[PDB]
Amino acid sequence: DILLTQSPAILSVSPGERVSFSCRASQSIGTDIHWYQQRTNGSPRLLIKYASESISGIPSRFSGSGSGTDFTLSINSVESEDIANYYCQQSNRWPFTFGSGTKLEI
Amino acid sequence: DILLTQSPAILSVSPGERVSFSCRASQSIGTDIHWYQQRTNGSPRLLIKYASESISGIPSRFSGSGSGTDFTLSINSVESEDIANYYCQQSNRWPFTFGSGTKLEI
Amino acid sequence: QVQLQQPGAELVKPGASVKLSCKASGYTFTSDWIHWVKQRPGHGLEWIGEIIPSYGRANYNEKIQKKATLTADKSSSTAFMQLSSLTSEDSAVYYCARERGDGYFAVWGAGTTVTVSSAKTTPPSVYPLAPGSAAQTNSMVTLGCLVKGYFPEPVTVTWNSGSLSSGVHTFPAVLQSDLYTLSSSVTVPSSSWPSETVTCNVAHPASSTKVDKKIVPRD
Amino acid sequence: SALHWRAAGAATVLLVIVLLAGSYLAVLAERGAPGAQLITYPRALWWSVETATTVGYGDLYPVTLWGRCVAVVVMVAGITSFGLVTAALATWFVGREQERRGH
Amino acid sequence: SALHWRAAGAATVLLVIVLLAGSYLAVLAERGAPGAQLITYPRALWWSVETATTVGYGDLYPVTLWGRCVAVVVMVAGITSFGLVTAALATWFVGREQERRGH
């Protein structure tokens, strides 16, 4: 099964600063990586699909890049509402799997 | 994306001595590696294309070898005019990428 | 002849935007792609994006914040890169290059030095540098010219309109109180001067100025 | 010249055009997609040939929708082309055999 | 319209249906098998086309029994379809040549 590694587990950034989350796949999975946001006591919310495709309703501040085994989720000029946990999920091979998550701290 | 690693970052050689620059690709890219020379305050200049193909106008002193993930740029009998920065660039997969460079010191 | 022509420099106030140009000449094919590469002082080359003029489509580096937008004018054979809402992080030399669709950059422009600052443009003052009266000359003699009080970078310094290249050293500029200063050195056979003239040509792209200063022995 | 021979000829000329436009188009669609390898004209042309011949090395192929679309066109064009030559050949033999039988 | 032209048409419509059901079915069979990549509809449809064309990129293929079964059906359907068009074309040329000979 595909293992998704999200490190570091916690990311500390100063307000308005650009931040980058990392997700590495145990094997090449093309661009079938997807990102979700989960704030305290909330449910997961799709931020990026297929590594870099935008989702309507999501701030232009969020962007994704990467293909193969290394993927990146980026936030331009972080702001309080961005404080949450971030997960990556692959759909390249069965069964789908999730990253261990990364928490954004300001 | 393909990561090109150029190490060491600085190479010290005695005059007239043969020198070898190294460029490793994060994944097999055949021979779609290209080398450029950039002297102080100048623009980049193509030295070798597709790993080992010569470019007209370039001294026979320059040669390239390697395929897959390990590539090498060689200079026979180095001379002052060779002092500059050297970059490798891959065109095997999108997007194209560059090495971090290596500086030749005599 | 120069295949790609780019403006020497562009000064941009933080927050503003600028449109860089790249005029191409020589053979042009429908398969030609024009690339843009950013290079910060002392750092490596960073690919920004590409565009194919014959169709007008552009691709951009996904790994970095998108500051550019590419466009091209087929009639004028000119490619443009619009950089918007810049900051000091955007200060660097931006090259454009030509790729014949076969994966390598056959030729590059001279690059355009972009500086993001609030400061105002200032042409440089060029002063001569001739030996003192008590200086003993050898088989060679060293002269030079001082270029100070200019902004922003860069400045191109040549000797005798470029006919004099050997024995020339131009020192890196130093920044002090929002102004740059640098000197250029030239060494010629002691016998040839002052019999054979020696003049340093200083061009400052940002101010659209270019001045000459003949180097003659002190009174 | 008989129809079947003219058609075959036509199909060939048409295939060569499709190979070319295909190559160009393929690069156009593929650049911009992370990890795409179908991004330079020369190999793109090699990619189009093997595609038309349904050879299958797998050394190269499209990953974008439009790329794949272009691909389907080249495959079809190729198979149709080669099938038309076969028909042409069959028609040739059929006509000759009829002769050899006095008809 | 003559038979061979109607049949060809038919074969095409039939192929398109088989491509579609194939895609759906393929996903249905493949999910649940560890390491399967034939698990989302869009690529499954691309997988069915290349399968029907016998193209061979190898970027995708089934690993389960039912998946492979579905695969065999798409291959056959495809080859038969494309072969039927060839026959149709041959029949067309044969008829014309006969005319060009006064028969």
Author numbering:
A (entry chain B), B (entry chain B): 1 to 106
C (entry chain A): 1 to 219
D (entry chain C), E (entry chain C): 22 to 124
Task: Give excerpts from the publication.
Crystallographic occupancy studies show that in this conformation, ions bind at the ends of the filter (sites 1 and 4), with up to a single K+ ion distributed over these two sites. The sites in the conductive conformation are not compatible with the smaller radius of Na+: given only Na+ in solution, we observe experimentally that the channel enters the nonconductive conformation rather than binding Na+ at sites 2 and 3 (i.e., the nonconductive channel is more stable than a Na+-bound conductive channel). The K+-dependent conformational change represents a form of selectivity, because in the absence of K+ (i.e., in the presence of only Na+, which should not be conducted), the filter goes into a nonconductive conformation. Thus, in answering the question how does the K+ channel detect the size of an ion, we are led to conclude that the conductive conformation is associated with ion-binding sites that match the size of K+ but are too large for Na+.
Potassium channels conduct K+ ions at nearly diffusion-limited rates, and at the same time, they prevent Na+ ions from conducting. The ability to distinguish between K+ ions (Pauling ionic radius 1.33 Å) and Na+ ions (Pauling ionic radius 0.95 Å) occurs within a segment of the pore known as the selectivity filter. Inside the selectivity filter, K+ ions are coordinated by oxygen atoms from the protein, which replace the water molecules that normally surround a hydrated ion. Each K+ ion-binding site is composed of eight oxygen atoms made from the K+ channel TVGYG signature sequence.
